[PDB]
Structure formats: C-alpha cells, structure tokens
Amino acid sequence: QIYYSDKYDDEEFEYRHVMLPKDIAKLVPKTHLMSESEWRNLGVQQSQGWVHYMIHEPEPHILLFRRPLP
Amino acid sequence: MENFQKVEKIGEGTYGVVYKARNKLTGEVVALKKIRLDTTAIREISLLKELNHPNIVKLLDVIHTENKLYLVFEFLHQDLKKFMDASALTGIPLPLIKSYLFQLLQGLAFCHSHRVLHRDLKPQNLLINTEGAIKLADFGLARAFGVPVRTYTHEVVTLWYRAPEILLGCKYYSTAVDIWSLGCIFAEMVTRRALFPGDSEIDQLFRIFRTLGTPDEVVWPGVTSMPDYKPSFPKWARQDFSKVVPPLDEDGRSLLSQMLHYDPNKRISAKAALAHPFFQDVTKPVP
Numbered sequence A: 001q002i003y004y005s006d007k008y009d010d011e012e013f014e015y016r017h018v019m020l021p022k023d024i025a026k027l028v029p030k031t032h033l034m035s036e037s038e039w040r041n042l043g044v045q046q047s048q049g050w051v052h053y054m055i056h057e058p059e060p061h062i063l064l065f066r067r068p069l070p
Numbered sequence B: 001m002e003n004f005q006k007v008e009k010i011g012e013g014t015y016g017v018v019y020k021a022r023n024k025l026t027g028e029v030v031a032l033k034k035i036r037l038d039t040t041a042i043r044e045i046s047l048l049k050e051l052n053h054p055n056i057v058k059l060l061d062v063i064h065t066e067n068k069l070y071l072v073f074e075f076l077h078q079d080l081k082k083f084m085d086a087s088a089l090t091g092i093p094l095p096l097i098k099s100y101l102f103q104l105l106q107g108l109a110f111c112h113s114h115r116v117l118h119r120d121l122k123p124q125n126l127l128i129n130t131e132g133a134i135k136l137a138d139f140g141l142a143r144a145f146g147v148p149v150r151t152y153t154h155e156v157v158t159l160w161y162r163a164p165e166i167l168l169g170c171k172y173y174s175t176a177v178d179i180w181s182l183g184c185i186f187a188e189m190v191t192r193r194a195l196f197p198g199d200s201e202i203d204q205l206f207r208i209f210r211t212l213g214t215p216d217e218v219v220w221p222g223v224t225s226m227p228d229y230k231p232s233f234p235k236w237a238r239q240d241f242s243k244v245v246p247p248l249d250e251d252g253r254s255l256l257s258q259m260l261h262y263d264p265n266k267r268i269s270a271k272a273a274l275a276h277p278f279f280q281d282v283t284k285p286v287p
Helices: A036-041 B042-050 B080-086 B094-113 B176-191 B201-212 B250-259 B270-274 B277-281
Strands: A013-019 A051-054 A062-068 B004-012 B017-023 B029-036 B059-065 B068-073 B126-128 B134-136
Touching: B004 B029, B042 B059, B042 B068, B080 B126, B080 B176, B094 B134, B094 B176, B094 B270, B094 B277, B176 B250, B176 B270, B250 B270, B250 B277
Parallel strands: none
Antiparallel strands: A013 A062, A051 A062, B004 B017, B017 B029, B029 B068, B059 B068, B126 B134
C-alpha cells in the first residue's frame, strides 16, 4: 500500500506527505525524524533530496517530506 | 416507543440510523434516530427538548428502551448536502444563501447563549423544508457521545469543517468552532464545493494555511501555545477572497473573512454576525 500525496510548494520549499499502512507504521519510532536510509527502509520510494522534517503527533503514520526549491 | 408506526428508513447519521415515522396519536410524520447504546447522557439530552427556536430542529422526545436510545424529532425532507448535490448546475440563488446563513446564525446565536455547542457541524445536520427554512440538528449530542474518527457504519467522518484550534490540539476550545464550521458551509454554499477538503488532520491544516496564510504570532496571538504547532509548517500567504469566493460581494467576503478568523477570540460571534452589513437586504425565498 502506502498513499503518496500530491506535491505542494511554498516560496523556498516543495513538499509532499506519505500515509503509512498499519503494518509499516509499527516500524516508525515515536518522536523520530528519519534519514533517507531509514524511510527508504520502510518502503518509501522517493527521489533523493526529500527530508522527513516534521511529525504531526496526532497522526504518526503520516510522513511529512520537504525539499528546497528549485 | 409503541406509538410510532409506518416507520421507513431514511438514512444513516454518524451516531445511528434515521427513520421517517408516523405518530399514531397525532397523525404527524416524525423523524427517529436509533442510537445503539451498548456501553448520565440520556437525562442530559432530554434537557435539549427545552431549547426551542424556529431554526433548531425540534427535539420532540427521547426514549430509552433495552439498550436503544430513540430521538423523536421534527421531520424535514432534505439536508443541505443533498440540496447542494441537486443544485449543481445552477447553484443556490444568493438571496436563498443569504437567507440560509442568516437563519443559521440565529440558531447558533440561540444555542450559544445557553452554552450549548455543536462542535461537529456539517451540511448534513442542516435540515431544510419546502417553505424556505433551514434548521440545525444534533446540537449538544457531541458533549455526551463525543465525535469519533469513524462512524457507527465505520464511514470516515468529516474533518472539512473543523476549526484550526481543534486541529492544533487546543483542549480548552470556544463556541467559535461552530462559527468556523459555518463559515466553511457558507463558502461551500457559494462555490458548491468544500473550502478545505483535507484527507488527514495535517492535510486539513495545510489546506487552511494555503488559502488563509500560515498562522503566526502576528495573525493569531497565542498560536505558539497550541500543542500541535510546529515552526516548520509550509509558509503560505493569505489569498484574495475575490478569487477564492468569486460570486460573493464585498460584504459577503468581509463576513466570511471574519467567521474564518484564526484567533478564536477575535473571530466574529453569531450575535455580531447578525448585525453585519451583508444581511441588510435579507429576504426568505423557498428552496
């Protein structure tokens, strides 16, 4: 599974969020920002450059990615 | 419960099933809602039978029988979601829209004066009749049952109308949450589509930010006191309402803007919304 959100931008960043299934979500630590190797390990296929920059606590199964523009 | 005959199933709310019925004694049509009470809450909702207003769906009676709680209430033929679904190729006449919002603010203004909130206001609990009237259903039920992530038929509930403070984790939230939900319903009644249709709580927040600008201490003092505020949220600017809600006039935009204010404290109240210039020419055309 794994829902990949549409990309969205602001002035100096490009974004996207990924929603994880219950299985994969049990592998993501509590209040932890991940490195490419760590989220790629979860199955998240994404280009290089994306940064897990934030965690919305009420929905810890949504991975929020950021990447500087252009 | 034996006095309700000719019972037909109308639909499914987020609490239970809704039927159209007939009172054997009086011969009137009525609406029933069977909320399966598996596991005070009844005595408190019975007290809601005391809150009458031409714009509040009349709670005729509450009946508790063997693990079932039945709400006998006033019958209205359609809700706003269905009415907007059907008016998709013409929309709703601005005069009807101005009339609806006006009546909606008198019901909110009534209930709030009695410290009764809705908290989970959606177009679906907004009931219409053939005479041009619109009424609010389900006020005060959320503070007995609480509104869930999923319904009784496990359908996914609507985040679309939630206030930003609820979304950012505020525990001590206002009656201004209802004015927010109603400001969303207003724009939707005007554009025929939800102003902020998010797929998650964070997406719902981002949706709000893209249109209204990302909140900070300038536009929303005390926003940094919200449990779920992060200084790294995408940074957006407030969009121009003449673009967002095109048909609406300057007064219609001014009010929408004030009902959608970030700071709950500065957000217009139902009472003050009623005195707004927009309603200077309110009529009352039929559906």
